[PDB]
Design a protein around this ligand. Sequence first.
Ligand SMILES: COC(=O)c1ccnc(=O)[nH]1
Length: 160
Amino acid sequence: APSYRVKRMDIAKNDEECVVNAANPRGLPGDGVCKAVYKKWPESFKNSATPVGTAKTVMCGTYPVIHAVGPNFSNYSESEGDRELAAAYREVAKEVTRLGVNSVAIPLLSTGVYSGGKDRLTQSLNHLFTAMDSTDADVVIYCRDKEWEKKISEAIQMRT
Ligand SMILES: COC(=O)c1ccnc(=O)[nH]1
């Protein structure tokens, strides 16, 4: 049975068959999540650049890194940001399905430096669910904050 789980830990140390990078459209290392990811899979950043609201897979050996570019809400309107955030997760689902993986490590896109200083846990997570509910891979969501871990854990529990 495909499940959702949540783990408070560095996504760069995931035990899934592929990772989603919370990427910038330029395909740059940046800092935060994208740093950890650049350090663990640096050859995955060869031609990783992809537009806002899209996902691009680059192999590190045989290990797929999915660069998903959620919107920077500093730059977008709430309604355009929402559209772009939904579509990035949609692209993740397509890439996970194309890759035929049994599991995927995924961060909550647009909830850090790209949040525009707003709490978007529920917005980002719901878009993740909408997208990934149609796939048959185990989904492990990575966060750093305990409060976020619990709230994510509850949102998972209350769908079953
Ligand atoms: C994951 O938290 C973020 O703010 C983020 C940064 C870069 N790209 C994203 O898609 N999201």
